[PDB]
Short mmCIF file of C-alpha atoms and ligand atoms in Angstrom, two decimals:
data_model
loop_
_atom_site.label_atom_id
_atom_site.label_comp_id
_atom_site.label_asym_id
_atom_site.label_seq_id
_atom_site.Cartn_x
_atom_site.Cartn_y
_atom_site.Cartn_z
CA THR A 13 30.64 -10.23 4.94
CA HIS A 14 28.03 -11.63 7.31
CA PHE A 15 25.20 -9.24 8.15
CA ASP A 16 22.96 -8.93 11.18
CA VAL A 17 19.87 -8.85 8.99
CA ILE A 18 19.13 -9.41 5.29
CA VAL A 19 15.96 -7.92 3.75
CA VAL A 20 14.88 -9.53 0.48
CA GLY A 21 12.72 -7.01 -1.44
CA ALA A 22 13.63 -3.42 -0.58
CA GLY A 23 10.26 -1.96 -1.54
CA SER A 24 7.42 -0.48 0.54
CA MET A 25 7.80 -2.81 3.51
CA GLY A 26 11.43 -3.84 3.19
CA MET A 27 12.87 -0.34 2.83
CA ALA A 28 10.93 0.83 5.90
CA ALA A 29 12.34 -2.18 7.78
CA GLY A 30 15.80 -1.27 6.57
CA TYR A 31 15.43 2.28 7.87
CA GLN A 32 14.27 1.03 11.27
CA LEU A 33 17.17 -1.45 11.53
CA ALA A 34 19.84 0.98 10.37
CA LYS A 35 18.69 3.73 12.78
CA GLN A 36 19.57 1.29 15.61
CA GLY A 37 23.02 0.43 14.29
CA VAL A 38 21.98 -3.05 12.99
CA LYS A 39 24.24 -4.13 10.11
CA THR A 40 21.71 -4.61 7.31
CA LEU A 41 21.81 -5.74 3.66
CA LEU A 42 18.80 -5.09 1.44
CA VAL A 43 18.59 -6.91 -1.89
CA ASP A 44 16.21 -5.83 -4.65
CA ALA A 45 15.51 -7.12 -8.17
CA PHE A 46 15.47 -3.47 -9.35
CA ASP A 47 16.51 -0.09 -7.89
CA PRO A 48 13.72 1.19 -5.61
CA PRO A 49 11.64 3.17 -6.02
CA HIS A 50 10.79 1.69 -9.43
CA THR A 51 7.76 0.98 -11.71
CA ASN A 52 7.81 -2.86 -11.69
CA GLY A 53 6.26 -3.58 -8.26
CA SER A 54 3.44 -2.25 -6.09
CA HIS A 55 4.60 1.24 -5.04
CA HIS A 56 4.57 3.58 -8.10
CA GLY A 57 1.91 5.86 -9.60
CA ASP A 58 3.11 8.69 -7.28
CA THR A 59 0.45 8.76 -4.55
CA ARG A 60 -1.22 6.60 -1.94
CA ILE A 61 -4.19 7.17 0.34
CA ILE A 62 -3.76 6.92 4.09
CA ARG A 63 -7.02 6.53 6.04
CA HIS A 64 -7.36 6.05 9.80
CA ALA A 65 -11.06 5.15 10.06
CA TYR A 66 -10.77 1.84 8.30
CA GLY A 67 -13.57 0.13 6.26
CA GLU A 68 -11.53 -3.15 5.96
CA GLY A 69 -11.80 -3.39 9.76
CA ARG A 70 -11.61 -1.23 12.89
CA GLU A 71 -8.71 -3.37 14.18
CA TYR A 72 -6.35 -1.67 11.64
CA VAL A 73 -6.84 1.76 13.29
CA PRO A 74 -3.93 1.62 15.85
CA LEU A 75 -1.45 0.66 13.15
CA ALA A 76 -2.77 3.40 10.87
CA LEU A 77 -2.40 6.02 13.63
CA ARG A 78 1.14 4.89 14.46
CA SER A 79 1.98 4.88 10.75
CA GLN A 80 0.65 8.43 10.40
CA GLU A 81 2.97 9.65 13.20
CA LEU A 82 5.87 7.86 11.54
CA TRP A 83 5.09 9.62 8.25
CA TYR A 84 5.18 13.02 10.03
CA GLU A 85 8.54 12.02 11.51
CA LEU A 86 9.79 11.12 8.01
CA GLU A 87 8.60 14.49 6.65
CA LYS A 88 10.77 16.19 9.27
CA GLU A 89 13.83 14.02 8.48
CA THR A 90 14.06 14.37 4.69
CA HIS A 91 13.92 17.00 1.97
CA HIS A 92 11.58 14.84 -0.11
CA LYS A 93 7.83 15.55 0.18
CA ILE A 94 6.06 12.84 2.22
CA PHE A 95 2.47 13.76 3.09
CA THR A 96 -0.23 16.26 2.34
CA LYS A 97 -3.41 16.43 4.42
CA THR A 98 -6.12 16.20 1.74
CA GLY A 99 -8.56 14.45 4.05
CA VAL A 100 -10.32 11.28 2.79
CA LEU A 101 -13.96 11.11 1.74
CA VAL A 102 -15.78 7.76 1.87
CA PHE A 103 -19.30 7.53 0.41
CA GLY A 104 -21.78 4.99 -0.90
CA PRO A 105 -25.52 4.26 -1.13
CA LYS A 106 -27.11 4.49 2.31
CA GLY A 107 -27.61 1.00 3.80
CA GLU A 108 -25.79 -0.77 0.94
CA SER A 109 -22.03 -0.47 1.69
CA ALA A 110 -20.30 -2.64 4.28
CA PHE A 111 -17.15 -0.56 3.59
CA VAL A 112 -18.87 2.74 4.49
CA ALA A 113 -20.58 1.18 7.52
CA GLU A 114 -17.34 -0.25 8.94
CA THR A 115 -15.52 3.06 8.29
CA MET A 116 -18.21 4.75 10.41
CA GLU A 117 -18.02 2.12 13.17
CA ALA A 118 -14.24 2.38 13.24
CA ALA A 119 -14.38 6.13 13.68
CA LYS A 120 -16.80 5.79 16.62
CA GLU A 121 -14.85 3.00 18.28
CA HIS A 122 -11.56 4.94 18.17
CA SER A 123 -12.98 8.44 18.66
CA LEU A 124 -11.65 9.66 15.32
CA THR A 125 -12.51 13.17 14.11
CA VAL A 126 -14.90 12.77 11.17
CA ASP A 127 -17.80 14.61 9.51
CA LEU A 128 -20.99 12.73 8.52
CA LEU A 129 -22.80 14.06 5.47
CA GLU A 130 -25.44 12.90 3.05
CA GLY A 131 -26.87 13.48 -0.37
CA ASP A 132 -26.78 17.03 -1.59
CA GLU A 133 -24.57 18.05 1.39
CA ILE A 134 -21.74 16.14 -0.35
CA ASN A 135 -22.31 17.85 -3.70
CA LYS A 136 -22.54 21.29 -2.00
CA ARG A 137 -19.41 20.89 0.14
CA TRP A 138 -17.22 19.70 -2.76
CA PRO A 139 -18.18 21.22 -6.13
CA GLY A 140 -17.31 18.59 -8.69
CA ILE A 141 -18.91 15.62 -6.90
CA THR A 142 -22.36 14.51 -8.08
CA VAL A 143 -23.81 11.69 -5.95
CA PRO A 144 -27.45 10.58 -5.72
CA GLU A 145 -29.49 11.96 -2.83
CA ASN A 146 -29.64 8.48 -1.21
CA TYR A 147 -25.83 8.37 -0.74
CA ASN A 148 -24.19 8.96 2.66
CA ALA A 149 -20.62 9.81 3.52
CA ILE A 150 -17.99 10.04 6.20
CA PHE A 151 -15.15 12.51 5.72
CA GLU A 152 -11.92 12.27 7.65
CA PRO A 153 -10.15 15.67 7.69
CA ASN A 154 -6.83 14.62 9.19
CA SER A 155 -5.83 11.71 6.92
CA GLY A 156 -4.56 12.24 3.39
CA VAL A 157 -2.09 11.40 0.69
CA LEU A 158 1.41 10.00 0.77
CA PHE A 159 3.98 10.38 -2.03
CA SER A 160 4.93 6.73 -2.02
CA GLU A 161 7.97 6.77 -4.32
CA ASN A 162 9.34 9.65 -2.23
CA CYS A 163 8.71 7.66 0.98
CA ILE A 164 10.81 4.71 -0.24
CA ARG A 165 13.50 7.01 -1.64
CA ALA A 166 13.76 8.89 1.67
CA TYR A 167 13.89 5.72 3.76
CA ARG A 168 16.59 4.41 1.38
CA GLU A 169 18.74 7.51 1.60
CA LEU A 170 18.39 7.71 5.39
CA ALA A 171 19.13 4.02 5.86
CA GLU A 172 22.16 4.16 3.55
CA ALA A 173 23.54 7.21 5.41
CA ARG A 174 23.49 5.06 8.57
CA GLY A 175 25.41 2.22 6.86
CA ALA A 176 22.67 -0.03 5.37
CA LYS A 177 23.80 -1.56 2.10
CA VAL A 178 21.46 -1.94 -0.86
CA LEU A 179 22.35 -4.44 -3.62
CA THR A 180 20.31 -3.47 -6.64
CA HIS A 181 19.29 -5.25 -9.85
CA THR A 182 19.81 -8.60 -8.06
CA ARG A 183 17.18 -11.32 -7.86
CA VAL A 184 17.13 -13.69 -4.92
CA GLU A 185 16.64 -17.16 -6.41
CA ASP A 186 16.78 -19.44 -3.35
CA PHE A 187 17.22 -19.73 0.42
CA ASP A 188 19.06 -21.91 2.88
CA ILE A 189 17.83 -21.56 6.44
CA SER A 190 19.70 -23.01 9.46
CA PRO A 191 18.78 -22.80 13.19
CA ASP A 192 21.37 -20.04 13.75
CA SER A 193 21.79 -18.34 10.38
CA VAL A 194 20.18 -17.55 7.05
CA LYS A 195 21.52 -17.58 3.51
CA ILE A 196 20.29 -16.17 0.20
CA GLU A 197 21.41 -17.19 -3.30
CA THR A 198 21.63 -14.69 -6.26
CA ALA A 199 23.37 -14.53 -9.68
CA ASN A 200 25.56 -11.79 -8.12
CA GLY A 201 26.58 -13.97 -5.12
CA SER A 202 25.33 -15.60 -1.89
CA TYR A 203 24.97 -13.72 1.42
CA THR A 204 24.50 -14.75 5.05
CA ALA A 205 23.01 -13.16 8.17
CA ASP A 206 21.50 -13.95 11.55
CA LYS A 207 17.96 -12.97 10.48
CA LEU A 208 15.95 -12.73 7.27
CA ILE A 209 13.05 -10.45 6.33
CA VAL A 210 11.10 -11.57 3.24
CA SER A 211 9.17 -8.76 1.56
CA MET A 212 9.05 -9.47 -2.19
CA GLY A 213 5.60 -8.10 -2.93
CA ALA A 214 3.90 -9.74 -5.92
CA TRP A 215 6.82 -12.19 -6.17
CA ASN A 216 6.08 -13.66 -2.74
CA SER A 217 3.43 -15.59 -4.71
CA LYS A 218 6.23 -17.40 -6.58
CA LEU A 219 9.19 -17.56 -4.16
CA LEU A 220 7.81 -18.39 -0.66
CA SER A 221 7.64 -21.92 -2.07
CA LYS A 222 11.47 -21.96 -1.68
CA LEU A 223 10.81 -21.57 2.07
CA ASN A 224 8.38 -24.53 2.10
CA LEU A 225 5.29 -22.33 2.29
CA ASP A 226 2.18 -22.85 0.24
CA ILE A 227 -0.11 -19.90 0.84
CA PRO A 228 -2.61 -18.53 -1.72
CA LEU A 229 -1.21 -15.15 -2.87
CA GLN A 230 -2.69 -14.05 -6.16
CA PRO A 231 -1.17 -11.08 -8.01
CA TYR A 232 -3.55 -8.68 -9.81
CA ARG A 233 -2.92 -6.08 -12.53
CA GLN A 234 -4.27 -2.73 -11.25
CA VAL A 235 -4.23 0.39 -13.39
CA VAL A 236 -4.63 4.06 -12.49
CA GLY A 237 -5.23 7.03 -14.76
CA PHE A 238 -4.71 10.79 -14.41
CA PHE A 239 -7.32 12.93 -16.20
CA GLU A 240 -7.44 16.58 -17.28
CA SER A 241 -9.79 18.21 -14.78
CA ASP A 242 -11.52 21.45 -13.86
CA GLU A 243 -8.79 22.82 -11.60
CA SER A 244 -11.25 25.22 -9.91
CA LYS A 245 -13.02 22.12 -8.51
CA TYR A 246 -10.57 19.20 -8.34
CA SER A 247 -7.27 20.81 -7.25
CA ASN A 248 -5.75 20.06 -3.87
CA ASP A 249 -5.43 23.87 -3.69
CA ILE A 250 -9.23 24.18 -3.41
CA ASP A 251 -9.52 21.37 -0.84
CA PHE A 252 -10.73 18.56 -3.11
CA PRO A 253 -10.28 15.41 -1.02
CA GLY A 254 -8.73 12.01 -1.51
CA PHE A 255 -11.51 9.43 -1.70
CA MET A 256 -12.37 5.75 -1.51
CA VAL A 257 -15.99 4.98 -2.34
CA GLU A 258 -18.37 2.08 -2.85
CA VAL A 259 -20.92 2.06 -5.65
CA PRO A 260 -23.14 -0.84 -6.88
CA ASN A 261 -20.45 -2.22 -9.21
CA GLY A 262 -17.49 -1.89 -6.81
CA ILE A 263 -14.95 0.33 -5.02
CA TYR A 264 -13.00 3.22 -6.59
CA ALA A 265 -10.21 5.31 -5.07
CA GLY A 266 -8.80 8.63 -6.22
CA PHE A 267 -6.81 11.76 -5.58
CA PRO A 268 -7.16 15.51 -6.16
CA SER A 269 -5.04 17.15 -8.86
CA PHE A 270 -1.66 18.22 -7.45
CA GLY A 271 0.03 21.07 -9.30
CA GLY A 272 -2.19 20.48 -12.37
CA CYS A 273 -1.32 16.74 -12.72
CA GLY A 274 -5.05 15.87 -13.02
CA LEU A 275 -7.39 13.87 -10.81
CA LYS A 276 -6.08 10.28 -10.42
CA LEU A 277 -8.50 7.30 -10.24
CA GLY A 278 -8.28 3.50 -9.79
CA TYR A 279 -10.95 0.78 -9.81
CA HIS A 280 -9.99 -1.13 -6.67
CA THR A 281 -12.22 -4.24 -6.65
CA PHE A 282 -11.38 -5.43 -10.22
CA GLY A 283 -8.08 -6.27 -11.89
CA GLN A 284 -6.68 -9.02 -14.12
CA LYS A 285 -5.11 -12.11 -12.55
CA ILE A 286 -1.48 -12.07 -13.67
CA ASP A 287 2.01 -13.46 -13.09
CA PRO A 288 4.48 -10.74 -12.01
CA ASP A 289 7.05 -11.81 -14.56
CA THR A 290 4.66 -11.73 -17.58
CA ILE A 291 2.27 -8.83 -16.67
CA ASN A 292 1.68 -6.30 -19.41
CA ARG A 293 2.81 -3.02 -17.80
CA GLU A 294 1.44 -0.71 -20.53
CA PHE A 295 -1.67 1.27 -19.67
CA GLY A 296 -4.40 1.01 -22.31
CA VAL A 297 -3.65 -2.44 -23.81
CA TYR A 298 -7.05 -3.60 -22.53
CA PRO A 299 -10.07 -1.33 -23.27
CA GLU A 300 -11.29 -1.62 -19.68
CA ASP A 301 -8.14 0.20 -18.39
CA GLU A 302 -9.54 3.58 -19.45
CA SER A 303 -13.25 2.74 -19.85
CA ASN A 304 -13.80 1.49 -16.28
CA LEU A 305 -12.38 4.78 -14.97
CA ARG A 306 -14.44 7.00 -17.26
CA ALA A 307 -17.60 5.03 -16.32
CA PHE A 308 -17.13 6.30 -12.74
CA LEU A 309 -15.99 9.83 -13.62
CA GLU A 310 -18.84 10.66 -16.00
CA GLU A 311 -21.39 9.70 -13.30
CA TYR A 312 -19.81 10.97 -10.02
CA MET A 313 -17.02 13.45 -10.93
CA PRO A 314 -18.00 14.78 -14.34
CA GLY A 315 -15.59 17.69 -14.53
CA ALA A 316 -12.60 15.34 -13.99
CA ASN A 317 -13.20 13.33 -17.20
CA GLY A 318 -10.98 15.12 -19.75
CA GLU A 319 -8.02 13.84 -21.71
CA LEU A 320 -5.95 10.99 -20.24
CA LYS A 321 -2.72 12.68 -19.19
CA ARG A 322 -0.92 9.63 -17.72
CA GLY A 323 -1.53 5.97 -16.90
CA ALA A 324 0.27 3.42 -14.71
CA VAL A 325 0.12 -0.33 -14.17
CA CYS A 326 0.75 -1.64 -10.67
CA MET A 327 0.15 -4.90 -8.79
CA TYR A 328 -1.89 -5.97 -5.83
CA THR A 329 -1.14 -9.28 -4.04
CA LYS A 330 -4.27 -10.72 -2.38
CA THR A 331 -4.77 -13.23 0.38
CA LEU A 332 -8.08 -15.10 0.49
CA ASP A 333 -9.36 -12.88 3.36
CA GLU A 334 -7.64 -9.67 2.02
CA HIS A 335 -5.83 -9.24 5.39
CA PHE A 336 -2.06 -8.99 5.49
CA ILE A 337 0.49 -11.61 6.49
CA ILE A 338 3.04 -10.33 9.02
CA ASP A 339 4.61 -13.06 11.14
CA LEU A 340 7.54 -15.32 11.76
CA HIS A 341 7.90 -18.29 9.49
CA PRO A 342 6.18 -21.14 11.39
CA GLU A 343 9.24 -23.41 11.15
CA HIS A 344 12.01 -20.73 11.32
CA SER A 345 11.94 -18.05 14.07
CA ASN A 346 14.88 -16.28 12.31
CA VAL A 347 12.72 -15.63 9.23
CA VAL A 348 10.13 -12.83 9.08
CA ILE A 349 7.42 -12.72 6.38
CA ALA A 350 5.56 -9.63 5.09
CA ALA A 351 3.14 -10.57 2.31
CA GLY A 352 -0.37 -10.32 0.92
CA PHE A 353 -1.05 -6.60 1.37
CA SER A 354 -4.14 -6.99 -0.81
CA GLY A 355 -4.09 -3.50 -2.38
CA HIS A 356 -4.24 -1.50 0.90
CA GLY A 357 -0.84 -1.82 2.60
CA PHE A 358 1.19 1.26 1.60
CA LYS A 359 -0.27 3.54 4.27
CA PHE A 360 0.93 1.08 6.94
CA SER A 361 4.42 0.57 5.53
CA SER A 362 6.07 2.89 8.08
CA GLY A 363 4.42 1.00 10.97
CA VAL A 364 5.08 -2.37 9.28
CA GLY A 365 8.76 -1.46 9.02
CA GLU A 366 8.76 -1.01 12.80
CA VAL A 367 6.95 -4.33 13.32
CA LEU A 368 9.35 -6.22 11.02
CA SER A 369 12.41 -4.72 12.76
CA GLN A 370 11.03 -5.80 16.15
CA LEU A 371 10.21 -9.31 14.88
CA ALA A 372 13.68 -9.69 13.37
CA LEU A 373 15.60 -8.46 16.43
CA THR A 374 13.44 -9.92 19.22
CA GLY A 375 10.99 -12.48 17.75
CA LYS A 376 8.09 -10.39 19.12
CA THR A 377 6.46 -7.01 18.57
CA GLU A 378 4.71 -4.55 20.83
CA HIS A 379 2.02 -4.18 18.14
CA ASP A 380 -1.04 -6.45 18.09
CA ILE A 381 -0.60 -8.34 14.85
CA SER A 382 -2.97 -11.25 15.61
CA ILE A 383 -5.17 -10.63 12.59
CA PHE A 384 -2.11 -11.00 10.31
CA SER A 385 -1.10 -14.46 11.60
CA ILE A 386 0.44 -16.78 9.00
CA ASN A 387 -1.33 -19.74 10.73
CA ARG A 388 -4.91 -18.45 10.47
CA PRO A 389 -7.38 -20.82 8.71
CA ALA A 390 -8.78 -18.11 6.44
CA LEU A 391 -5.53 -18.03 4.43
CA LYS A 392 -6.07 -21.59 3.15
CA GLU A 393 -8.39 -22.92 0.42
CA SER A 394 -11.12 -25.37 1.47
C1 FAD B 16 -0.58 -1.22 -7.22
C2 FAD B 16 -1.34 -0.30 -6.32
C3 FAD B 16 -1.26 -0.48 -4.94
C4 FAD B 16 -1.94 0.34 -4.04
C5 FAD B 16 -2.70 1.39 -4.55
C6 FAD B 16 -2.87 1.52 -5.95
C7 FAD B 16 -2.20 0.70 -6.83
C8 FAD B 16 -2.44 0.92 -8.31
N1 FAD B 16 -3.31 2.32 -3.75
C9 FAD B 16 -3.09 2.23 -2.42
C10 FAD B 16 -3.50 3.31 -1.60
O1 FAD B 16 -4.01 4.33 -2.00
N2 FAD B 16 -3.17 3.15 -0.27
C11 FAD B 16 -2.50 2.07 0.29
O2 FAD B 16 -2.36 2.02 1.52
N3 FAD B 16 -2.11 1.05 -0.50
C12 FAD B 16 -2.37 1.14 -1.80
N4 FAD B 16 -1.85 0.18 -2.65
C13 FAD B 16 -1.21 -1.00 -2.08
C14 FAD B 16 0.23 -0.82 -1.71
O3 FAD B 16 0.88 -0.01 -2.69
C15 FAD B 16 0.92 -2.17 -1.55
O4 FAD B 16 0.13 -2.93 -0.64
C16 FAD B 16 2.36 -2.12 -1.09
O5 FAD B 16 3.09 -1.27 -1.97
C17 FAD B 16 2.97 -3.48 -1.04
O6 FAD B 16 4.38 -3.31 -0.66
P1 FAD B 16 5.41 -4.48 -0.78
O7 FAD B 16 6.64 -4.00 -0.09
O8 FAD B 16 4.76 -5.74 -0.42
O9 FAD B 16 5.69 -4.55 -2.38
P2 FAD B 16 6.71 -3.66 -3.27
O10 FAD B 16 6.74 -2.24 -2.80
O11 FAD B 16 6.41 -4.00 -4.69
O12 FAD B 16 8.14 -4.27 -2.88
C18 FAD B 16 8.54 -5.59 -3.23
C19 FAD B 16 9.97 -5.50 -3.72
O13 FAD B 16 10.47 -6.84 -3.88
C20 FAD B 16 11.39 -6.80 -4.96
N5 FAD B 16 11.63 -8.16 -5.42
C21 FAD B 16 10.76 -8.99 -6.09
N6 FAD B 16 11.29 -10.16 -6.37
C22 FAD B 16 12.56 -10.13 -5.80
C23 FAD B 16 13.60 -11.07 -5.75
N7 FAD B 16 13.52 -12.30 -6.26
N8 FAD B 16 14.74 -10.74 -5.12
C24 FAD B 16 14.81 -9.49 -4.60
N9 FAD B 16 13.91 -8.51 -4.62
C25 FAD B 16 12.77 -8.91 -5.21
C26 FAD B 16 10.73 -5.87 -5.97
O14 FAD B 16 11.64 -5.43 -6.97
C27 FAD B 16 10.19 -4.76 -5.04
O15 FAD B 16 11.10 -3.68 -4.90
CL1 CL B 17 -0.63 -5.23 -2.47
NA1 NA B 18 -6.35 3.14 0.61
#
């Protein structure tokens, strides 16, 4: 059967696209290598931060705010848990964090509700945090934490109820694009449609070449660990925040303990360069997996440095500028590309789904997506 739209990669971005398309009666096929949500891509490890005041650049704020509303809509539509409003704390040494400074500028430019704190005010407000006196902070009370695997699962179940079809455990191997249709090849058969969305996460870095694109898209191995913690300090129940912070040796991001699961941490600015089909997915096979996390905890969050309860291994896919790619294919207006989310895309996946549906159906979007152009110079090596 010929579909209206085919989505290749039914993960964070593709499943949201599928939901958006199905809700409008568009006959959609989604094809995934696995059965999402799963532990082989970029969406597992339970939780994701959503921030509105945005240290990567104030121009992300409108998409973050739209995405936040879309997450509240999803919460109301499903029985799965979507969002909890932890707030997000950002801190770093005063005068020495571009990330903190841009977060602060973004909040001012968009009139976001934030608290500004410094030094011992941080340690007093949130027992369990120990920063130096020369640190400053911005705290965003109304952002928080998404349950990412639940988000994809809910979008899948809602899309399928409206007639979207999901073909699981099926790798797309090649493409054939014509002026008025698209075709995909798999070991389980070939499929056609009017429009294609390409959203294969870390595998975009290997398979966009089949669409005559050569864009730097390096996959990275990124681990997270959950640690036995002082629940009187680090529980969501006592208002411990989500956080993303800059210190001299890089950026870390973490989560309060939910229901006793332990504080979760990741080192965001370091990971191993990998290939998505040979990555070692076991936490702890490199000493740095656990040691880089405890180096942070023992200094800044010392009561959250107990036994390792759980570890996960997940992938980032970076562009050279660490901004996303969301655009039509430059040679094929019936092909939409979502790639290069550079370790910070999940929070936008609801809004991106809307963008991708608009691009597929109309060739345009009401959102300003200029900074995500596939033709920008900053994507290309010298
Ligand atoms: C790994 C990670 C990411 C991350 C994070 C922490 C970790 C450890 N913390 C974040 C946070 O707190 N807040 C946030 O906003 N983002 C954060 N991220 C990044 C975010 O998770 C990613 O940017 C995002 O998940 C990327 O989504 P995308 O949709 O691009 O990738 P995916 O969910 O892995 O989905 C891709 C799908 O494609 C399928 N696939 C692959 N190859 C094929 C072929 N050949 N054919 C068909 N399907 C294919 C995959 O199976 C997958 O389902
Ligand atoms: Cl990513
Ligand atoms: Na984040």
